[PDB]
Amino acid sequence: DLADRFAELERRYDARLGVYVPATGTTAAIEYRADERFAFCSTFKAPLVAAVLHQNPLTHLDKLITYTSDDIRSISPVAQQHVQTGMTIGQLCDAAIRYSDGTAANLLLADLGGPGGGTAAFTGYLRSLGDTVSRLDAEEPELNRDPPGDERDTTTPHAIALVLQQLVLGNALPPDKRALLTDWMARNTTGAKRIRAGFPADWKVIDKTGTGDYGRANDIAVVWSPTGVPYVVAVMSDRAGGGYDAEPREALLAEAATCVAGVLA
Ligand SMILES: O=C(O)[C@@H]1CS[C@H]([C@H]2C[C@@H]3CCSCN3N2)[C@@H](CO)CN1
């Protein structure tokens, strides 16, 4: 029984675990705390990039964005190295997804524009995909400071799964923008010990991770079986029982993904 395995893992890592895999083909939906709210953490960066792709011509990717010291306010492995020359929208999308670059995320939010520094339009983008649940209320690094239970800056494994399904497998984006998003998530550098670690090597995996205080660790992915059958896999977790300093545990998400992969094989 799968719900039993997920419960075992919660006890092992002193964690709250949320899992959703949408129903597809002759495969039933997998769901565990799938409608409870979990912090986005950095996972929002993937649909952010979709929002910015949708809103503009693909030529927009080549627009150069300049920024400086007081824009670097969060973990920003790529933006910190290019601050003197600036970065193109394209480079920023690349960094936001592949290195979870926070400054890139803020600059892309600003590019979207409108109230809340972009966060309202980010949310409106999800609403356009039929996601009535998720909300982004702040940008980096403030979006990470909400305590356990706080509804600000949250999604649900169910909500973000259906969003990612439309973005990557569905027609939320035209093919050329869709490929750009898909390719960036394929080339993700941060996700090796999470959902990717639970699936056999001959499965293709693309993903965006999230991490936070209170032991938050997320991963949202699309996986393809060796015969090309795709599944969307959303895994979210926290370990709020250990307080603000509780360490995120990637192994939890890797074990949860192993349980899911065995069921989808
Ligand atoms: O800039 C920040 O302070 C935040 C902290 S939480 C989390 C951090 C936390 C994790 C630790 C090491 S590197 C990647 N970092 N990503 C990110 C997304 O999951 C968001 N960036």
From Swiss-Prot:
CC per GO annotation: extracellular region; periplasmic space; plasma membrane
Keywords, in A-Z order: Antibiotic resistance, Cell inner membrane, Cell membrane, Hydrolase, Membrane, Periplasm, Secreted, Signal
A molecular function GO annotation: beta-lactamase activity
Record's keyword annotation contains Manganese: no
Catalytic center residues: 42, 140
Gene ablation phenotype (knockout): Cells lacking this gene become significantly more susceptible (16- to 32-fold) to penicillins as well as third-generation cephalosporins and carbapenems. They have no detectable beta-lactamase activity.
Catalytic activity: a beta-lactam + H2O = a substituted beta-amino acid
Activity regulation information from UniProt: Is inhibited by sulbactam, tazobactam, and clavulanate. Sulbactam inhibits the enzyme competitively and reversibly with respect to nitrocefin. Tazobactam inhibits the enzyme in a time-dependent manner, but the activity of the enzyme reappears due to the slow hydrolysis of the covalently acylated enzyme. In contrast, clavulanate reacts with the enzyme quickly to form hydrolytically stable, inactive forms of the enzyme, via irreversible acylation of the catalytic serine residue.
The protein's Enzyme Commission number: 3.5.2.6
Name of the top EC class for this enzyme: hydrolase
Family matches, as InterPro entries: Beta-lactam/transpept-like (IPR012338), Beta-lactam_cat (IPR045155), Beta-lactam_class-A (IPR000871), Beta-lactam_class-A_AS (IPR023650)
Induction: Constitutively expressed.
Practical use: Can be used as a biomarker, which together with BlaC-specific fluorogenic substrates, allows a rapid and accurate detection of very low numbers of M.tuberculosis for the clinical diagnosis of tuberculosis in sputum and other specimens.
GO biological process: beta-lactam antibiotic catabolic process; response to antibiotic
PROSITE patterns recorded: BETA_LACTAMASE_A
SUPFAM superfamilies referenced in this protein's UniProt entry, alphabetically: beta-lactamase/transpeptidase-like
Keyword Secreted: yes
Consequence of substituting residue 140 to A: Loss of catalytic activity with cefamandole as substrate
Quaternary structure note: Monomer.
More info: The class A beta-lactamase family has a specific amino-acid numbering system, sometimes called Ambler or ABL numbering and often misspelt as Amber. A multiple sequence alignment was used to derive a consensus sequence and then the consensus was numbered taking into account insertions and deletions. This allows use of identical numbers, e.g. for active site residues, despite differences in protein length. UniProt always uses natural numbering of residues, hence there appear to be differences in numbering between this entry and some papers.
Name of the protein described by the UniProt record: Beta-lactamase
Species for this entry: Mycobacterium tuberculosis (strain ATCC 25618 / H37Rv)
